Coordinates of C-alpha atoms and ligand atoms in Angstrom, one line a residue:
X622 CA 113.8 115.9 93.8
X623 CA 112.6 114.7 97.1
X624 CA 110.7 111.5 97.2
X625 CA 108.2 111.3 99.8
X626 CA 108.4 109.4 103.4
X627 CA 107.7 105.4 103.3
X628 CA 106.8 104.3 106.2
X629 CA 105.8 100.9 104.6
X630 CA 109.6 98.2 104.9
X631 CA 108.7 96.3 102.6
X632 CA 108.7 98.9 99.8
X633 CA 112.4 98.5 100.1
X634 CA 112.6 95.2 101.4
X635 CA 114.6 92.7 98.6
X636 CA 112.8 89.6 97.5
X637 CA 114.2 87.3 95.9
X638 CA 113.3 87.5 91.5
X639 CA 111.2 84.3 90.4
X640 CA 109.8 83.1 86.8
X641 CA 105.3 84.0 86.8
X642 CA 105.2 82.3 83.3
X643 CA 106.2 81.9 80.2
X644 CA 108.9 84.7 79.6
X645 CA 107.2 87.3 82.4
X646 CA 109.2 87.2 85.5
X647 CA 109.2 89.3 88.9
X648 CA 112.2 91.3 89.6
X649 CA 110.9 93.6 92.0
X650 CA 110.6 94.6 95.6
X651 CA 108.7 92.6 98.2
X652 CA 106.0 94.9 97.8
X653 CA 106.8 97.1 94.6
X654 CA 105.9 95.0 91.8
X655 CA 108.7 94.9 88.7
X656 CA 107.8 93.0 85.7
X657 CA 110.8 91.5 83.2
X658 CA 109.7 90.4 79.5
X659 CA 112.5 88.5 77.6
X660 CA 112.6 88.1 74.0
X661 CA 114.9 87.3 71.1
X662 CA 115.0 90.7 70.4
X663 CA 115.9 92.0 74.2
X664 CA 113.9 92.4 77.1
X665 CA 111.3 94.7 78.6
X666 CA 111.0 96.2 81.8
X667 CA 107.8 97.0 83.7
X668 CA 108.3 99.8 86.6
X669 CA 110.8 100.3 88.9
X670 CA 110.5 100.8 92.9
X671 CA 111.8 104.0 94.9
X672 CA 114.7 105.7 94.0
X673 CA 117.0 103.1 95.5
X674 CA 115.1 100.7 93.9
X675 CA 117.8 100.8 90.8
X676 CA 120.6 98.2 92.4
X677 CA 118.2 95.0 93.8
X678 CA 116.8 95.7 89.8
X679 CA 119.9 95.3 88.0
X680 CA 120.5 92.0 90.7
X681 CA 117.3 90.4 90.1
X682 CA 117.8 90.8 86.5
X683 CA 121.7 89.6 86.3
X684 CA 120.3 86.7 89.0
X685 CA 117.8 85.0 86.8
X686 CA 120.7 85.1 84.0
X687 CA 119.7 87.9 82.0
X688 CA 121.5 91.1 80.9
X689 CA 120.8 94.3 81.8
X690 CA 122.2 95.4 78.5
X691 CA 119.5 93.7 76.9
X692 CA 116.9 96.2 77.8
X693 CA 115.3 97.5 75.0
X694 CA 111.8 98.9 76.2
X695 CA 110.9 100.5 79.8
X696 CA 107.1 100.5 80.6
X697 CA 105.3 101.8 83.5
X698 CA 101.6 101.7 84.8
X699 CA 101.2 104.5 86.8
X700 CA 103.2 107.7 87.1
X701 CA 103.6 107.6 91.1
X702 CA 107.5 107.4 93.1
X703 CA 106.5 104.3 94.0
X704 CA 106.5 102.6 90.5
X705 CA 109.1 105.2 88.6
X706 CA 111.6 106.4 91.2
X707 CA 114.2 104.5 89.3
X708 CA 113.2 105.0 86.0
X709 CA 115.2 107.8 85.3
X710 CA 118.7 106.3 86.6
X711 CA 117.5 102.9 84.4
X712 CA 116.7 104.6 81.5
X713 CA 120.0 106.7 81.2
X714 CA 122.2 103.0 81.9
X715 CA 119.8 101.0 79.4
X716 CA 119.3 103.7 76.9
X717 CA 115.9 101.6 76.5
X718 CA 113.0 103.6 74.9
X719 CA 110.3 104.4 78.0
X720 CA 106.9 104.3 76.4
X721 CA 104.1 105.9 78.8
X722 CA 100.2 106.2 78.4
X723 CA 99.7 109.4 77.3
X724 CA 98.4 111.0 80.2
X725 CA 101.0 110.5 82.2
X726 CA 104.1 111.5 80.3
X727 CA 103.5 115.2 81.6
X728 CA 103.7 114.3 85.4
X729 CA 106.6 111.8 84.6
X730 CA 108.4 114.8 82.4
X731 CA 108.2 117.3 85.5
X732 CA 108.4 114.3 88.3
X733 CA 105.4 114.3 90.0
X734 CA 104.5 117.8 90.6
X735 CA 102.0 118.5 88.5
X736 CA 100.3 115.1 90.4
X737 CA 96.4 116.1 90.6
X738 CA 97.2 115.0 94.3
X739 CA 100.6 115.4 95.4
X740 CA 101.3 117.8 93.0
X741 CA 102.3 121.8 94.2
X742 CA 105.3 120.6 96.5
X743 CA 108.3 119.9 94.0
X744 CA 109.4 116.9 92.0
X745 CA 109.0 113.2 94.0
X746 CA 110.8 111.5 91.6
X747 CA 113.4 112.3 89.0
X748 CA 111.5 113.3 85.8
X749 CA 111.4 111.4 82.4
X750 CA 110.7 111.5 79.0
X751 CA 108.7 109.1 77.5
X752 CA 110.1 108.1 74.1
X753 CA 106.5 107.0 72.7
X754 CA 103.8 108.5 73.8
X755 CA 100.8 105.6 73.8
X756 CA 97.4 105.2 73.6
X757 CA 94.5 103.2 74.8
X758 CA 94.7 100.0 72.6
X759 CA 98.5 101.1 71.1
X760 CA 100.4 97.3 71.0
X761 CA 104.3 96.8 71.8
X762 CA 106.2 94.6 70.0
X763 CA 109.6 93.3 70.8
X764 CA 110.4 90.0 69.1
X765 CA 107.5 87.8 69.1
X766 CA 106.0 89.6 72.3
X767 CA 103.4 91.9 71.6
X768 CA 102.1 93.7 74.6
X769 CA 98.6 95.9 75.0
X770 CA 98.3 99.0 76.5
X771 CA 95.0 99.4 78.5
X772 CA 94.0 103.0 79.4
X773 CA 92.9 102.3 82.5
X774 CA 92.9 106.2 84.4
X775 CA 91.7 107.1 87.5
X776 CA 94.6 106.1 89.9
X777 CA 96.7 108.6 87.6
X778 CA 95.3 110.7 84.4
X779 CA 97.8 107.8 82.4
X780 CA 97.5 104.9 84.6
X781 CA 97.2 101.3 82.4
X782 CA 97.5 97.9 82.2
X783 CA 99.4 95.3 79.5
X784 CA 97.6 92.8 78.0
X785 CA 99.8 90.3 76.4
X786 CA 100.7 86.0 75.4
X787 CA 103.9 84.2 77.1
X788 CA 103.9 80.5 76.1
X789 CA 106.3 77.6 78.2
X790 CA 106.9 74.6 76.4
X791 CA 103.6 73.0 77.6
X792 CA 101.2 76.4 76.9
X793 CA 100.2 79.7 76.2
X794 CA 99.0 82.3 78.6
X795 CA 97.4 85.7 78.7
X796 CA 98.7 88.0 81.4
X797 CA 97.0 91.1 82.7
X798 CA 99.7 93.0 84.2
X799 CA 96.8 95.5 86.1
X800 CA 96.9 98.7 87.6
X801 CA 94.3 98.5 89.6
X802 CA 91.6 101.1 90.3
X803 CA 92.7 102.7 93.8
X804 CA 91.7 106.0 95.1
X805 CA 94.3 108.2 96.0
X806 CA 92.7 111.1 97.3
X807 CA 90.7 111.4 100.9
X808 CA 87.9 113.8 99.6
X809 CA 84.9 113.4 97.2
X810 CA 85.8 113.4 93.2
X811 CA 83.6 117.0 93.2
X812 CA 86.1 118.3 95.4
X813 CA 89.1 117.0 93.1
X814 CA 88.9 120.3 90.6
X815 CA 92.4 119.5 88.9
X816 CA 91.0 116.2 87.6
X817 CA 87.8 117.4 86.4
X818 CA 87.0 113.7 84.5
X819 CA 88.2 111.8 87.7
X820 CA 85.0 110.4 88.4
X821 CA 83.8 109.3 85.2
X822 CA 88.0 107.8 84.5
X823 CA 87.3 105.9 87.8
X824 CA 83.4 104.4 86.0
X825 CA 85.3 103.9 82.9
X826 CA 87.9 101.6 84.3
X827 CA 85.9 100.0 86.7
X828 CA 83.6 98.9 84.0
X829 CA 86.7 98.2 81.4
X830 CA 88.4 95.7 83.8
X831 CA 86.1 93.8 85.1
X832 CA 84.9 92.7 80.9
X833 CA 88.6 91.5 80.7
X834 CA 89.6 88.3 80.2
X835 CA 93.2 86.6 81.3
X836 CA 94.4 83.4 82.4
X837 CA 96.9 85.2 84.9
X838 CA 96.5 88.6 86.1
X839 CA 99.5 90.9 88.2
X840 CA 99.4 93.9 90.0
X841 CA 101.2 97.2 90.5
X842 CA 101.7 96.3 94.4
X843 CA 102.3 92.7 95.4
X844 CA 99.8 92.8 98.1
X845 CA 97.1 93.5 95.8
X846 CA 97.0 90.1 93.9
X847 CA 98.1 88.4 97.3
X848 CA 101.8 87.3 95.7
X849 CA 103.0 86.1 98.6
X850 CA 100.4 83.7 99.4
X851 CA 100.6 82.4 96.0
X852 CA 104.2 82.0 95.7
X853 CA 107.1 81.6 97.8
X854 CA 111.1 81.7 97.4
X855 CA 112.1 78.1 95.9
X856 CA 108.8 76.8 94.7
X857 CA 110.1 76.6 91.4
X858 CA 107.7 77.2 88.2
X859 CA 104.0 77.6 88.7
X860 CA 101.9 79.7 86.3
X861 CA 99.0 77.5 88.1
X862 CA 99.4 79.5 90.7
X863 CA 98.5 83.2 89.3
X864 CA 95.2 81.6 88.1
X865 CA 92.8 83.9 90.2
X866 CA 89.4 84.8 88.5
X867 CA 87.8 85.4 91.9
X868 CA 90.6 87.3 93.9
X869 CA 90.5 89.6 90.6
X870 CA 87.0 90.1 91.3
X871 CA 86.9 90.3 95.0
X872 CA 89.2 93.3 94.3
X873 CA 87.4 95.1 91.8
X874 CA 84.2 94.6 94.0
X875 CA 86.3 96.6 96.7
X876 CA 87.1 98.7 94.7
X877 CA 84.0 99.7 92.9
X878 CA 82.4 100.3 96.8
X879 CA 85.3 102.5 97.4
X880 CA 84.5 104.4 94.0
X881 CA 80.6 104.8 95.3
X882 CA 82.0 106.6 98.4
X883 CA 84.7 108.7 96.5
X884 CA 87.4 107.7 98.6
X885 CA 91.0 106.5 100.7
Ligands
CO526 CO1 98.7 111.2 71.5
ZN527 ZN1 99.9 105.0 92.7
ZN528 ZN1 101.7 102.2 94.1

């Protein structure tokens, strides 16, 4: 296995794990976005970062005075070395059950290399297993959560989002946790002949997301729903915050010209 160069810091960089809402928290890099889901019945974990990813995880988790014991389910959105380098080495400490969109679980079982993209040159991260193999619409349930799957492809053949209710004491909220619709590749979808359905994946989730509706929506990379900006180490709770109809559109905009060019 031999995970590709990052030439982007704050991949790595450690940020310190806050509460979104409700019983979603962030317990990720300062760029690679982690997701933790606590229940009465244990807690779920939504990607990792790189392969040394696994120890700031583990931190951010014990910090916000949970247990890394508790983990009973392991999610991801997309099957890329950015957002499953750790998954194997948490997986084998939790024993959790990883449940992947479908297509996906066949890059995650050989590690990348079958990647329509940056497949051909070995595993880039260690391989998995997914215990359940989901599909679009498919619903998680641990304790009184009960998550979503949204086959959202394009990004990866298996790349999704969660759809799912948290409640505080005061209210309820629905959280997209979104992969959002980035193009991988530099050429034209025609040219891409290992995904032959790329194109119409892309037109499909393009037109999928934007007819969701959310009170809070999250994102894969931290950058793309502008985290920082919208929360800083020590503000304390503020689900008010993550309310962002319009940056959610502005990106999908974006992305939708980037779709019309085929490319980035
Ligand atoms: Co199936
Ligand atoms: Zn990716
Ligand atoms: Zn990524």
């Amino acid at each position: 296995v031999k995970e590709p160069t990052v030439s982007n810091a704050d991949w790595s960089k450690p940020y310190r794990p806050f509460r979104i809402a409700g019983n979603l928290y962030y317990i990720g890099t300062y760029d690679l976005a982690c997701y933790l889901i606590t229940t009465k019945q244990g807690n779920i974990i939504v990607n990792t970062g790189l392969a040394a990813s696994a120890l700031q995880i583990k931190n951010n988790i014990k910090a916000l005075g949970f247990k890394l014991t508790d983990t009973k389910i392991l999610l991801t959105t997309q099957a890329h070395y950015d957002h499953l380098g750790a998954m194997a080495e948490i997986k084998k400490i939790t024993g959790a059950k990883l449940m992947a969109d479908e297509g996906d679980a066949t890059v995650m079982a050989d590690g990348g290399s079958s990647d329509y993209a940056f497949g051909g040159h070995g595993s880039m991260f260690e391989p998995i297993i997914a215990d359940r193999l989901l599909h679009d619409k498919d619903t998680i349930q641990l304790g009184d959560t009960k998550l979503v799957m949204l086959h959202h492809p394009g990004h990866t053949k298996g790349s999704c989002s969660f759809l799912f209710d948290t409640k505080d004491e005061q209210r309820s909220y629905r959280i997209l946790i979104a992969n959002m619709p980035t193009i991988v590749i530099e050429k034209k979808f025609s040219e891409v002949s290992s995904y032959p359905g790329i194109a119409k994946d892309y037109a499909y989730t393009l037109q999928a997301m934007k007819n969701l509706s959310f009170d809070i929506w999250v994102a894969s990379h931290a950058s793309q729903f502008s985290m920082h900006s919208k929360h800083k180490p020590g503000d304390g709770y503020n689900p008010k915050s993550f309310m962002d109809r319009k940056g959610y559109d502005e990106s999908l905009d974006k992305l939708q010209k980037e779709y019309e060019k085929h490319l980035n």
